[PDB]
Scaffold this active site. Structure first.
Site, mmCIF file in Angstrom:
data_model
loop_
_atom_site.group_PDB
_atom_site.id
_atom_site.type_symbol
_atom_site.label_atom_id
_atom_site.label_comp_id
_atom_site.label_asym_id
_atom_site.label_seq_id
_atom_site.Cartn_x
_atom_site.Cartn_y
_atom_site.Cartn_z
ATOM 1 N N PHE A 14 49.759 45.226 42.946
ATOM 2 C CA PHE A 14 48.571 45.741 42.193
ATOM 3 C C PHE A 14 48.929 45.876 40.713
ATOM 4 C CE2 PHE A 14 47.708 47.068 46.587
ATOM 5 C CZ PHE A 14 46.479 46.471 46.768
ATOM 6 N N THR B 80 40.515 37.034 46.357
ATOM 7 C CA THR B 80 41.689 37.872 45.977
ATOM 8 C C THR B 80 41.917 38.924 47.060
ATOM 9 O OG1 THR B 80 41.402 37.426 43.682
ATOM 10 C CG2 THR B 80 42.850 39.312 44.244
ATOM 11 N N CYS C 131 45.760 47.635 39.136
ATOM 12 C CA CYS C 131 44.483 47.359 39.827
ATOM 13 C C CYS C 131 43.693 48.658 39.975
ATOM 14 C CB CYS C 131 44.732 46.773 41.207
ATOM 15 S SG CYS C 131 43.177 46.335 42.014
HETATM 16 C C1 COH Z 1 36.378 46.030 43.182
HETATM 17 C C2 COH Z 1 37.333 45.825 42.321
HETATM 18 C C3 COH Z 1 38.709 45.343 42.692
HETATM 19 C C4 COH Z 1 39.257 44.968 43.969
HETATM 20 C C5 COH Z 1 38.658 45.013 45.358
HETATM 21 C C6 COH Z 1 40.612 44.547 43.527
HETATM 22 C C7 COH Z 1 41.551 44.091 44.523
HETATM 23 C C8 COH Z 1 42.872 43.576 44.201
HETATM 24 C C9 COH Z 1 43.709 43.055 45.264
HETATM 25 C C10 COH Z 1 43.350 43.109 46.688
HETATM 26 C C11 COH Z 1 44.275 43.135 47.638
HETATM 27 C C12 COH Z 1 44.944 42.663 44.645
HETATM 28 C C13 COH Z 1 46.193 42.055 45.248
HETATM 29 C C14 COH Z 1 44.601 42.993 43.234
HETATM 30 C C15 COH Z 1 45.603 42.771 42.217
HETATM 31 C C16 COH Z 1 45.427 43.123 40.829
HETATM 32 N N1 COH Z 1 44.311 43.658 40.378
HETATM 33 CO CO1 COH Z 1 42.632 44.135 41.296
HETATM 34 N N2 COH Z 1 40.938 44.561 42.207
HETATM 35 C C17 COH Z 1 39.795 45.039 41.731
HETATM 36 C C18 COH Z 1 39.596 45.267 40.334
HETATM 37 C C19 COH Z 1 40.630 45.116 39.347
HETATM 38 C C20 COH Z 1 40.315 45.481 37.965
HETATM 39 C C21 COH Z 1 39.059 45.992 37.354
HETATM 40 C C22 COH Z 1 41.552 45.262 37.290
HETATM 41 C C23 COH Z 1 41.783 45.520 35.828
HETATM 42 C C24 COH Z 1 42.241 46.969 35.707
HETATM 43 C C25 COH Z 1 42.586 47.399 34.275
HETATM 44 O O1 COH Z 1 43.390 46.664 33.629
HETATM 45 O O2 COH Z 1 42.020 48.425 33.765
HETATM 46 C C26 COH Z 1 42.434 44.819 38.387
HETATM 47 C C27 COH Z 1 43.788 44.401 38.097
HETATM 48 C C28 COH Z 1 44.654 43.825 39.079
HETATM 49 C C29 COH Z 1 46.000 43.414 38.651
HETATM 50 C C30 COH Z 1 46.662 43.469 37.311
HETATM 51 C C31 COH Z 1 46.371 42.128 36.642
HETATM 52 C C32 COH Z 1 47.106 42.024 35.308
HETATM 53 O O3 COH Z 1 46.786 41.072 34.566
HETATM 54 O O4 COH Z 1 48.023 42.822 35.004
HETATM 55 C C33 COH Z 1 46.524 42.923 39.888
HETATM 56 C C34 COH Z 1 47.863 42.313 40.120
HETATM 57 N N3 COH Z 1 41.878 44.654 39.630
HETATM 58 N N4 COH Z 1 43.395 43.550 42.963
#
Ligand code: COH
Ligand SMILES: CC(C)C1=CC2=CC[C@@H]3[C@](C)(CCC[C@@]3(C)C(=O)N[C@@H](Cc3c[nH]c4ccccc34)C(=O)O)[C@H]2CC1
Length: 454
Positions: A392, A267, A399
């Site tokens: 995000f 991701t 995110c």
């Molecule tokens: C180390 C943890 C980490 C990293 C590096 C990360 C890196 C990235 C990343 C890198 C470029 C992208 C494009 C995303 C994209 C997303 N992340 Co994260 N995420 C991460 C932890 C999370 C967590 C935890 C959630 C849930 C958050 C909540 O709902 O409280 C999250 C939620 C998301 C969502 C919302 C999903 C939904 O169902 O609504 C998107 C879109 N993402 N994330």
């Protein structure tokens, strides 16, 4: 009150066969190009609506009207990510507890504390490439995944996967990837309780056990030592939710760790892979970003402050997130009866899917050049209308890792552009593989060292 368009149907199976494909997000994008800003998708026993326009997604992003839904994809991942932050409902007590405990561990300010560990892994990536022989090439998604996985391992729970020491992933990773593949395959599997799927289920359980065993052991070992570290696992063993006054229990901490490791894999590494793809396809943009990296990164090892002053590198990453957001959709449900865009009546419970790559090609927001890679789009972000740029996700369910993902990505790309000239030596033809995530499959480059010591 308008009738929603719907793509082609298959008798009793309705639209279900359209997702019988290895590139479903790319298929849904082509349907949106045909049908416009919203379409109904029906299958036996379900209906959802795919949104593509800023005009409608801005309403979908109204948290008083819509909350996060668990897609079937998220339901299948919950079998091993449990009620961690990603796979929990907003109304589950463990969501708001973990959100309150973890938010300070993920802030821009907290990134100063992880910076040294991120540099550890970025320096291993630079040394690997410095150490390649003249004829040799780089497998870009492969090496970016080595880095992003190891960065979250080390910052997450002081655990070294040592990915740059390996061809075969660490055992935990092979189980996590096969569990994720299994969860994704179940989306397209008719009659999953058919005994032909007996072997899948036994393998799925074995992989869940591998993951739980290693993570539960790292938690038990840390509690058994009393060691305080610069990592999320310390913050979770010590932290108390100010609302309930409770800490997370060890089960939920295991789910948070598994969740962060899912995220910190392809991701995050997808963003770096797409960014390097766009840079080698746009040499003028690559030159400008390389000029900023040489100007800013004046020290052997980059400082937290120096990463913050890589503004054009940050614009490059936002433009890669625009064109190929690596978490390309999220699901919502209507909290109450409501009318979307003055035109589409919804009942309480009705589901929306946000098609992020399609939102990010809304010509009413970005203009005619939406297919062009032009980081300068992001020079004045105040000009971007609300909810036009959503890589995000949205609101309180956005995110948590966004500042982590962007700090790691800006650091690593900075260092790549400081240390190496890049060659698209195969004239790589973009082929986007869809798993949990999107990646440029088979993307390969040559890196010629600028011979600048670390
Ligand atoms: C180390 C943890 C980490 C990293 C590096 C990360 C890196 C990235 C990343 C890198 C470029 C992208 C494009 C995303 C994209 C997303 N992340 Co994260 N995420 C991460 C932890 C999370 C967590 C935890 C959630 C849930 C958050 C909540 O709902 O409280 C999250 C939620 C998301 C969502 C919302 C999903 C939904 O169902 O609504 C998107 C879109 N993402 N994330
Ligand atoms: C776990 C996280 C990282 C992911 C979130 C996702 C969200 C939407 C997904 C996804 C992109 C995978 C491909 C299907 C798609 C686009 C989807 O609409 N899926 C709907 C509709 C659907 C497709 N097949 C189904 C089978 C049963 C029920 C619903 C469906 C859904 O999952 O709900 C998928 C990627 C993985």
């Amino acid at each position: 009150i308008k009738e929603m368009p719907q793509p082609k149907t298959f008798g009793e199976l309705k639209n279900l066969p359209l997702l019988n494909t290895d590139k479903p997000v790319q298929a849904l994008m082509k349907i949106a190009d045909e049908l416009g800003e919203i379409f109904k998708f029906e299958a036996p026993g379900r209906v959802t609506r795919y949104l593509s326009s800023q005009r409608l997604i801005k309403e979908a992003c109204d948290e008083s009207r819509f909350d996060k839904n668990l897609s079937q994809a998220l339901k299948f991942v919950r079998d091993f990510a449990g009620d961690g932050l990603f796979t929990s409902w907003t109304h589950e007590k463990n969501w708001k507890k973990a959100h309150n405990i973890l938010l300070p561990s993920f802030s821009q300010q907290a990134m100063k504390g992880y910076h040294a560990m991120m540099v550890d892994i970025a320096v291993q990536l630079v040394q690997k490439w410095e150490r390649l022989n003249a004829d040799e090439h780089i497998e870009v998604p492969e090496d970016m995944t080595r880095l992003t996985l190891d960065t979250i391992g080390l910052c997450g729970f002081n655990y070294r996967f040592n990915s740059f020491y390996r061809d075969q992933p660490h055992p935990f990773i092979t189980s996590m990837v096969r569990a994720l593949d299994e969860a994704m395959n179940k989306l397209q599997r008719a009659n999953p309780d058919d005994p032909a799927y007996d072997e899948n289920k036994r393998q799925f359980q074995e992989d869940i056990k591998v993951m739980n065993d290693l993570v539960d052991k790292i938690i038990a070992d840390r509690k058994a030592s009393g060691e305080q570290s610069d990592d999320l696992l310390t913050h979770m063993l010590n932290g108390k939710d100010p609302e309930t006054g409770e800490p997370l229990d060890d089960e939920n901490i295991r789910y948070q760790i598994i969740t962060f490791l899912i995220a910190g894999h392809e991701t995050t590494s997808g963003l770096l892979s797409f960014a390097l793809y766009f840079l080698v396809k746009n040499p003028h943009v690559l030159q400008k970003a390389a000029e900023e990296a040489a100007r800013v990164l004046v020290d052997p090892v980059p400082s937290y402050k120096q990463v913050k002053q890589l503004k054009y590198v940050g614009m490059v990453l936002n433009e890669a997130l625009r064109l190929w957001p690596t978490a390309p959709a999220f699901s919502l449900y209507a909290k109450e009866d409501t009318v979307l865009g003055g035109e589409y009546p919804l009942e309480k419970g009705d589901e929306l899917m946000v098609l992020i790559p399609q939102l990010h090609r809304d010509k009413t927001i970005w203009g005619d050049d939406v297919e062009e890679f032009r980081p300068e789009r992001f020079e004045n972000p105040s000009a971007i209308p609300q909810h036009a740029f959503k890589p995000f996700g949205n609101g309180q369910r956005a995110c948590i890792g966004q500042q982590f993902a962007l700090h790691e990505a800006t650091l690593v790309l900075g260092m790549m552009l400081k240390h190496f000239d890049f060659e698209d030596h195969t004239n790589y033809e973009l082929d986007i593989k869809e798993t949990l995530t999107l990646k440029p499959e088979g993307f390969v480059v040559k890196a010629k060292s600028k011979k600048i010591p670390l």
